[PDB]
Structure formats: structure tokens, C-alpha cells
Specification:
Elements: E1 8-16, E2 19-26, E3 29-36, H1 41-53, E4 64-72, E5 75-83, H2 90-96, H3 101-119, E6 130-132, E7 141-143, E8 149-151, E9 158-161, E10 166-168, H4 183-186, H5 195-214, H6 240-249, H7 264-274, H8 287-296
Antiparallel strand pairs: 1-2, 2-3, 3-5, 4-5, 6-9, 7-8, 9-10
Helix pairs in contact: 3-5, 3-8, 5-7
Bound molecules: the ligand COc1cc(-c2cncc3c2CN(C)Cc2cc(N4CCNCC4)ccc2-3)cc(OC)c1OC.
The site of the ligand COc1cc(-c2cncc3c2CN(C)Cc2cc(N4CCNCC4)ccc2-3)cc(OC)c1OC has 19 residues, from β1, β3 and β5.
Subcellular location: Membrane
EC number: 2.7.11.30
Family: Belongs to the protein kinase superfamily. TKL Ser/Thr protein kinase family. TGFB receptor subfamily.
Length: about 300
């Protein structure tokens, strides 16, 4: 039904090394079109495999519509068409508004539910495998109209099945975002032949996103400005060694504002992120435990 040639590219909502994301019109309705850059072709392939072959579908994962190739300007462009969320990314959303207690917990529980869906394998005939994301950040999370979020960008995902015990890391030249890089990645101790290692990298990045969101929830008339993780120690577009010095050498973690300790929700959230930030990867919580704890927090 939905084909690239029938979509009208209205305006560019994002550009970068990955390529571009456009707001498009298809049959009147709004759609999101990611035109992958030439350098990021392998990410389009892996994402197409997950959405089409694995048929990944969850309410807290960016709703896939159609994959497509289009020949334009004497070149073949790789397209990904998904649902369009007019609120933009959580990165944009956090800078535009503050959150109450319910809106903040709704955001982080929806992300945990999405991550738990990826990590947990459904067994049996045609059962979906376990998936690790490996590039979780606030720019890769979109805010829906009901206050919930969905996880986006599967170009780096790795897959694992328990029965066969096969790990599928693909061969993508893409590296994760350096700002959200887990310490075992920065010092090259991560066991690349073990699937659990990739889940624990997501948990680290999740903890960073949890910090970004909770800063924006107001308690007792106090709220922090939006800031990216490690905003105070690394520069814009931080280097691999910049992050190594902060996260590995100095063992630093995002600061917990003192005002958080006079609010029961932010205090429980602060404990939650620190349990996502252990230098020892095997000590961090699982996505399911995070989802359960976030379900119980008031
Ligand atoms: C981050 O991964 C993707 C995301 C989207 C997507 C979905 N729904 C809304 C937006 C986006 C794109 N991203 C850049 C956030 C965003 C931002 C804005 N803006 C308003 C104007 N000022 C700047 C911010 C508008 C729309 C979106 C689409 C994708 O595939 C088609 C993605 O790939 C897997």
C-alpha cells in the first residue's frame, strides 16, 4: 500500500551523519521518512530486517509502516517509513516543557516497557528473538500524544535466541553514540561474544535517559534545566577519550541534585539510575526489574 513514490516530503525535521528524517504526507496523513545516508547503509539493512523479517511491533517501539528503495537524483536512496509523532523526540520535548510526577513516571515506564520488549525473547514457532538496542539515547526516543514514549532506530540492534544459542551482531561499521557509551565499551572489556553484554549497555544508556527526564520533573517549585548526560565534563560531540576520562578514569556519574532528596519519587528514581550505572556490568538491573520497580514507584 504505502510506497515511497506516493509520499510527499513536506519538511525536514532532522539531519545528520545518519542521513535525514522528513515529515511526509501519504494519502493526507502525516508520516515520518528517514532517508539513510550513504555511509549508514548497513543500518538501513539491519533495521529493515527487524521490522520486516522479525516483524517487530510494540506500542513503545516506533511504529513501522514500510521499507522502500527509491531512485532519485541518479542515486538509489534507502527509505524507512514509520508513524509520525508531532511532539518530536524526548530530547526536543524535554527542552520545551517540564513534567509533573505522573507525566515523568509515564515517560520512563513507557521506555522501560519498550526496552523490556526488545530484551525479552518470545519462544516457539515464529517467536521473536531477544534484541539489544545498543544506541539508546533521548534523540532516539519519541513522545506520543498520550504522554507515552517509543524507542526508535534499530540500525545497531543485535539478536539472540536461547534454543539455538546463536548471537547475531551483524557487521555494521556504525559505532554507538559516544556520550552514552558504557564503561565496558570505553575500555574494551565488554564480552562481545556474550549477548548479556549488549543488554547491559542498554541498561547503562537507559539510566542516563532516566537522569535526563527526572531533572525535568518539578518538586516543591524546583526543576533543573534540560542538560545532556555529562554536560559539565565533556564538550559538544565528545571524543572517545573524552568519555573514557570521565566515565572510566574518574569514575564519574551524572550528579543527583540535592532537591531530589526532598521528593519521594525523585529519590526512588535516583536510586534506580545508580543501579543502572555500576562499573561492573553484571551488577546492573535488568530491563524487567526496572519496569517492575517503575511500576511500583509513586
Ligand atoms: C530518531 O529516529 C527516528 C525518528 C523519527 C521521527 C518520528 N516522529 C517525529 C520526529 C521524528 C524525527 N526526530 C528527528 C524527532 C523529531 C523532531 C521534530 N522537530 C520539530 C522542529 N524543530 C526540531 C524538532 C519533528 C519530528 C520528529 C523517524 C524515524 O524513521 C522514519 C527515525 O528513525 C528510526
Amino acid at each position: 500500500r504505502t510506497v515511497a513514490r506516493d509520499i510527499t516530503l513536506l519538511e525536514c525535521v532532522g539531519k545528520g551523519r545518519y542521513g535525514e528524517v522528513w515529515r511526509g504526507s501519504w494519502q493526507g496523513e502525516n508520516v515520518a521518512v528517514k532517508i539513510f545516508s550513504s555511509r549508514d547503509e548497513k543500518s538501513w539493512f539491519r533495521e529493515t530486517e527487524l521490522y520486516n523479517t522479525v516483524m517487530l511491533r510494540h506500542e513503545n517501539i516506533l511504529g513501522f509502516i514500510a521499507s522502500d528503495m527509491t531512485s532519485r537524483h541518479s542515486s538509489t536512496q534507502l527509505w524507512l517509513i514509520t508513524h509520525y509523532h508531532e511532539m518530536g523526540s524526548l530530547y526536543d520535548y524535554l527542552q520545551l516543557t517540564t513534567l509533573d510526577t505522573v507525566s515523568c513516571l509515564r515517560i520512563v515506564l513507557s521506555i522501560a516497557s519498550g526496552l523490556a520488549h526488545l530484551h525479552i525473547e518470545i519462544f516457539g514457532t515464529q517467536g521473536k528473538p531477544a534484541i539489544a538496542h545498543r544506541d539508546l539515547k533521548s534523540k532516539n526516543i519519541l513522545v506520543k500524544k498520550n504522554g507515552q514514549c517509543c524507542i526508535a532506530d534499530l540500525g545497531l540492534a543485535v539478536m539472540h535466541s536461547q534454543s539455538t544459542n546463536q548471537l547475531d551482531v551483524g557487521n555494521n561499521p556504525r559505532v554507538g553514540t559516544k556520550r552514552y557509551m558504557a564503561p565496558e565499551v570505553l575500555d574494551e572489556t565488554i564480552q562481545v561474544d556474550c549477548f548479556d553484554s549488549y543488554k547491559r549497555v542498554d541498561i547503562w544508556a537507559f539510566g542516563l535517559v532516566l537522569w535526563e527526564v527526572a531533572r525535568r520533573m518539578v518538586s516543591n517549585g524546583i526543576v533543573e534545566d534540560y542538560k545532556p548526560p555529562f554536560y559539565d565534563v565533556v564538550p559538544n560531540d565528545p571524543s572517545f577519550e573524552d568519555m573514557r576520562k570521565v566515565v572510566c578514569v574518574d569514575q564519574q556519574r551524572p550528579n543527583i541534585p540535592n532537591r531530589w532528596f526532598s521528593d519521594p519519587t525523585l529519590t526512588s528514581l535516583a536510586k534506580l539510575m545508580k543501579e543502572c550505572w555500576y562499573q561492573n556490568p553484571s551488577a546492573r538491573l535488568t530491563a524487567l526489574r526496572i519496569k517492575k520497580t517503575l511500576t511500583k514507584i509513586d
